[PDB]
A paper describes a structure:
RNR is an essential enzyme found in almost every organism that converts ribonucleotides to deoxyribonucleotides. The first-identified and most-studied class of RNRs, the class Ia RNRs, uses a diiron-oxo center to generate a stable tyrosyl radical in the radical-generating β subunit that travels >30 Å to the active site in the catalytic α subunit to remove the 2′-hydroxyl group from the ribonucleotide diphosphate substrate. In order to respond to the deoxyribonucleotide needs of the organism, class Ia RNRs have two allosteric sites in addition to the catalytic site: the specificity site, which determines which of the four ribonucleotide substrates is bound in the active site; and the activity site, which acts as a general on/off switch for the enzyme. When dATP is bound in the activity site, class Ia RNR enzymes have been shown to form ring-shaped structures that physically prevent radical transfer between the β and α subunits; when ATP displaces dATP, the β and α subunits can come together to form an active α2β2 complex.
The 4.3 Å resolution structure of [name] class Ia RNR in the inactive α4β4 oligomeric state solved using the chameleon with a fast dispense-to-plunge time yields molecular information regarding similarities and differences to the well studied Escherichia coli class Ia RNR α4β4 ring. Here, we were able to generate a structure of the [name] inactive RNR complex resolved to 0.744x the Nyquist limit (4.3 Å resolution at 1.5998 Å/pixel) through the use of the blot-free chameleon with a fast (54 ms) dispense-to-plunge time but not through a traditional blotting-based plunging technique (which produced a 5.6 Å resolution structure). First, we confirmed that in the presence of activity effector dATP, the [name] class Ia RNR forms a protein complex similar in structure and subunit composition to the well studied E. coli class Ia RNR. In particular, when dATP is bound to the activity sites within the N-terminal regions (i.e., cone domains) of either the E. coli or [name] α subunits, each α subunit interacts with a β subunit, forming four α/β interfaces and an α4β4 ring-shaped structure. Within the [name] α/β interface, there is density for residues homologous to the E. coli class Ia RNR interface residues, indicating close similarity between the two structures in this region; additionally, a similar amount of solvent-accessible surface area (495 Å2 and 575 Å2 for [name] and E. coli, respectively) is buried in the α/β interface upon formation of the α4β4 structure. Density for both residues S41 and H25, which have recently been identified as important residues for organism viability and drug resistance, are visible in the α/β interface region, suggesting that the compounds may act on the α/β interface region.
Numbering used by the authors:
A (entry chain E): 281 to 346, 374 to 376
B (entry chain D): 5 to 738
C (entry chain E): 36 to 84
D (entry chain C): 245 to 373
């Protein structure tokens, strides 16, 4: 996980970009790690485990996966 | 290339690659489930060279509030933060306003304010009071608030839109201006209470008072009344009056049920030139004039009695399909009704309409008594040689109800209940009309020309205290103990265009106030509207403010003299409005009388002579969004309210949506209007002036998806039984 | 719950030349240098992995 | 005055060429609320009233100068085919003309209309020198 995080710096230490530069992608990979590891049996290595830092990606990724008163 | 933009100053900036997420992170610094990437991407903005960062903020906030729903209704606070940020930018550019002086002393000569505040206070205590308004509380609004605020709530040129104020200095500025004529020994320690009240959203204020405070044009009323009798000079005078008065934030209750029929002219000539049809065009064109102060367009509301020889044949004037002879659809028509007309319909009597001026002692008798009124009504049915028009009540009522269901704007006033519960004395000066919003009443005298003091028109002034933003009702007294006092200084401070309007409003000093939020307090209580658990649940605390506001008024006016016309009031006799109600059974929502403060009325008869009116219940539709409350007493259309106006499409949310997701009830889920009727009748137990009620149906719960004719008539009748106040929009649902 | 289903689920088969991908070259020139750099870096990482 | 006087066999020469343009409001507010279009409805309804003594129906006649910033775009108000925004066909409209306007047309000068109240010493000068 730390190796992938360190990798996600070289392709970004040249300039900004819309959508995600360093913090959004870091939160995304941390959440992906924490969500994927809790499917084989292992203590959670990252705390928080909050909402998906980028939810629209779930829109494309294999929605059809396998009186008188 | 040269990826530059027009920055705040005008110089060519960078490519806006970085430093763009900084503002959205500043916004969502303590929120949750907010998709910063989505809102930064779903903006769908064009990136052409030659854009201004102000326009970029405008479009990103236009796209921010667009993507909102009950799924993630969280970053509306983010939209509000961005809004107040852009506002503070367009105000100064930086994020640090001056110390209340460099802004006030530097902009006083700009003419937007009144050139007396600086001459009414001291520079020394100015800075002392300045260190009490840290703007950190300004980050608690909603987008639905800042939207209307930037639209029309604060001082700004209506052609340039260059805003020159800040929603934080607003409250303290109005609280300082309202306390000018006061002893210089406690005002400094007294304004802080009012500021803490208004800033914490505990007390709500309308546009007429927040759109017009500290402004050179000193006008602060909310509604006015006027009635015209059979005279040309009177018609010219009232036309001049409506043309001149509506130009400053006015509300009109015009009444012209005493002009003429179509019988004849004595001294030779036509009767009335087709009657009221051409005459009402004058009033329609008059009310269609300059904006009411520069915020919106006013709309008056006329009235006429049902027994008019010109029958409901003119009532079609609000219908859509028809010739252009008489179809003036620009007003809110009104018709009068008493306790006998519905009885004549139930018995089946064919009502015979007649001419007002052709008979004597009938129009005033329509409001005065019953014996002489009935005797005359039958004596004419007996008198042959006078020209009338008879028709079965069924056809007339059916046409009226069809027109109401079609246009959805025809209002009806219950004159019988308009006197049997008013604090005035219905023996020397009864009521005759109501304002366009149908929540107030006061005597009115016609006039021959505006320059004469013979005539007299009246007005009022509103305010609102929240119900739900509190923790315990006990402190409410103190709250009241401020606001009415403040409201006192409001009366002797404003100006009056009509020379005759000054005397009546300086004498009676009529004043009524209400409430904004209703659903949040009911949900916090724990009862709904359908079953009826709220039929008496609101009689525990809400039944106490109406009786304890008089206590505050007495304690705050026991030494401020007396009302020059206090003798013309039923409450001036010695009986408090604690049991003077004509309920159906007086026990439909039976509960013990919680606060029978006879010492209050004792001290009132002793020396207590306060403002004539006490309170009211206004819908406060344009208001109540500054604090993000429920619009009036009516429940919301849904959990999230999608509203539309000339600005765009807004999406407001009800408070406590997270912890009370399913705790309210949508008006789409309440088919029985009997619950709403019982609720407003329970409110009738302590209402002072009136309530602006409303009904609504749904064609998805009828036989053939078509409206009925007796079920809604039954609802009207059971509303006429108990809890009998004005009517309003039919409010169908397409 | 194995290849008896998941290998039987591989019915999404598709020819890569069967799709139309032509707008790439028309929408690749006018772009920042770093954008193309990171795009090619991602493509290389994907193909190598 | 028009409401009271027309009721006895009267003939009206109303003139309102000095009301406002559509520029702005000094003390804060809209310029003129679309200008003369809503204001003239008042006069139109006023003259449409009781018979002039009981014999016939009177009909007034308004006037306005050609150099008004609100140009002949409002002159269409007497036309038949059009929307109901501003088509009040109940009056006898009038327009002012001097010795120079026709000369400016003959020479071909494109007349530039302007606001009456925004400038000083122009309306009376239109009749003086
Ligand atoms: N890098 C950028 N280039 C151009 N516009 C930008 C950029 N970042 C943001 N904007 C938009 C949003 C800002 O509210 C607006 C300019 O506001 P401004 O405060 O002057 O930007 P700034 O924070 O970079 O300057 P400064 O640091 O001096 O305050 O333009
Ligand atoms: N020129 C008119 N001819 C006929 N009726 C008119 C005329 N102008 C107005 N009316 C309508 C509205 C007036 O209230 C009513 C006449 O009453 P009024 O204004 O007092 O004049 P009047 O005294 O000459 O007639 P009357 O004796 O009937 O009251 O008829
Ligand atoms: N367009 C309108 C609407 C209402 N009103 C008046 O304002 C009251 C109801 O409107 P409101 O209380 O929602 O106005 P705000 O205080 O919300 O700005 C009634 O007394 C109306 O007569 C008005 O003057 N003009
Ligand atoms: Mg900045
Ligand atoms: Mg008369």
């Amino acid at each position: 996980a730390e190796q992938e995080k360190e990798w996600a710096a070289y392709l970004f230490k040249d300039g900004s970009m819309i959508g995600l530069n360093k913090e959004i992608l870091s939160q995304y990979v941390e959440y992906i790690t924490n969500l994927r590891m809790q499917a084989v049996g292992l203590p959670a290595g990252f705390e928080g485990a909050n909402q998906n830092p980028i939810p629209w990606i779930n829109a494309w990724l294999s929605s059809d996966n396998v009186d008188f008163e | 290339t040269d990826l530059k933009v027009t920055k705040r100053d005008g110089r060519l900036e960078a490519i806006d690659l970085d430093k763009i997420h900084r503002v959205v992170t500043w916004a969502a610094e303590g929120l949750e489930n907010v998709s910063v990437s989505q809102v930064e991407l779903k903006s769908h903005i064009q990136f052409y060279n030659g854009i201004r960062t102000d326009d970029i903020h405008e479009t990103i906030i236009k796209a921010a509030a667009d993507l909102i729903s009950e799924d993630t209704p969280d970053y509306q606070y983010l939209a509000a933060r961005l809004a107040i940020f852009h506002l503070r930018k367009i105000a100064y550019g930086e994020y640090e306003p001056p110390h209340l002086y460099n802004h006030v002393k530097k902009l006083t000569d700009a003419g937007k304010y009144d050139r007396h505040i600086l001459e009414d206070y001291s520079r020394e205590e100015f800075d002392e009071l300045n260190a009490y308004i840290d703007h950190e509380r300004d980050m608690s609004f909603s987008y639905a608030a800042v939207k209307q605020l930037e639209g029309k709530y604060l001082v700004q040129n209506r052609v340039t839109r260059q805003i020159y104020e800040t929603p934080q200095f607003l409250y303290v500025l109005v609280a300082m201006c309202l306390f000018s004529k006061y002893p210089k020994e406690a005002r400094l320690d007294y304004v802080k209470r009012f500021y803490d009240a208004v800033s914490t959203f505990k007390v709500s204020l309308p546009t007429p008072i927040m759109s017009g405070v500290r402004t050179p044009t000193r006008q602060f009323s909310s509604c006015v009344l006027i009635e015209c009798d059979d005279s040309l000079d009177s018609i010219n005078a009232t036309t001049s009056a409506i043309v001149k008065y509506v130009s400053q934030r006015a509300g009109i209750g015009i009444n012209a049920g005493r002009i003429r029929g179509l019988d004849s002219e004595i001294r030779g000539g036509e009767a009335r030139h087709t009657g009221c049809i051409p005459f009402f065009k004058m009033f329609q064109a008059a009310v269609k004039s300059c904006s009411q102060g520069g915020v919106r367009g006013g709309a008056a509301t006329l009235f006429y009695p049902l027994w008019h020889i010109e029958a409901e044949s003119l009532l079609v004037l609000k219908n859509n399909r028809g010739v252009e002879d008489n179809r003036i659809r620009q007003l809110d028509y009104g018709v009068q009704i008493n306790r006998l007309l519905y009885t004549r319909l139930i018995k089946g009597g064919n009502i015979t309409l007649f001419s007002p001026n052709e008979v004597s002692g009938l129009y005033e008798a329509f409001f005065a008594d019953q014996d002489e009124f009935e005797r005359l009504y039958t004596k004419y049915e007996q008198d042959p040689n006078i020209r009338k028009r008879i028709i079965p009540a069924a056809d007339l009522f059916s046409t009226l109800m069809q027109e109401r269901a079609g246009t959805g704007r025809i209002y009806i006033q219950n004159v019988d209940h308009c006197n049997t519960h008013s604090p005035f004395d219905p023996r020397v000066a009864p009521v005759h009309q109501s304002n366009l919003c149908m929540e107030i009443a006061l005597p009115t005298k016609p006039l021959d020309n505006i320059n004469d003091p013979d005539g007299e028109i009246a007005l009022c002034t509103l305010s609102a205290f929240n119900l739900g933003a509190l923790n315990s009702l006990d402190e409410l007294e103190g709250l009241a103990d401020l606001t009415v006092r403040a409201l006192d200084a409001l009366l002797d401070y404003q100006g009056y265009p009509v020379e005759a309007a000054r005397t009546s409003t300086m004498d009676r000093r009529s004043l009524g106030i209400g409430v904004i939020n209703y659903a949040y307090y009911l949900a916090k209580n724990g009862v709904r509207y359908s079953d009826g658990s709220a039929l008496g649940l609101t009689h525990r605390t809400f039944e106490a403010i109406q009786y304890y506001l008089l206590k505050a008024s007495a304690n705050l006016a026991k030494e401020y003299g007396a009302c020059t016309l206090f003798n013309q009031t039923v409450y001036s006799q010695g009986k408090l409005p604690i049991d003077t109600y004509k309920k159906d059974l007086d026990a439909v929502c039976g509960e013990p009388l919680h606060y029978d403060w006879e010492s209050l009325r004792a001290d009132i008869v002793k020396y207590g002579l306060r403002n004539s009116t006490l309170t009211a219940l206004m819908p406060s539709e344009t208001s109540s969004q500054i604090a993000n409350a429920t619009n009036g007493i009516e429940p919301p259309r849904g959990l999230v309210t999608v509203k539309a106006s000339k600005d765009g499409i807004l999406k407001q949310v009800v408070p406590e949506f997270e912890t009370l997701k399913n705790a309210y009830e949508t008006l789409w889920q309440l088919p029985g209007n009997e619950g709403y009727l019982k609720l407003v009748g329970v409110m009738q137990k302590f209402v002072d002036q009136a309530i602006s009620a409303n009904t609504a149906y749904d064609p998805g719960k009828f036989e053939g998806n078509k409206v009925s004719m007796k079920q809604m008539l039954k609802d009207l009748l059971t509303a006429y039984k108990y809890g009998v106040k004005t009517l309003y929009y039919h409010n169908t649902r397409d | 719950v194995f290849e008896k289903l998941i290998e039987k689920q591989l019915s999404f088969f598709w020819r890569p030349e069967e799709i139309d991908v032509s707008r790439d070259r028309i929408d690749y020139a006018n772009l920042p240098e770093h954008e193309k750099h990171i795009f090619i870096s991602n493509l290389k990482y994907q193909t190598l992995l």
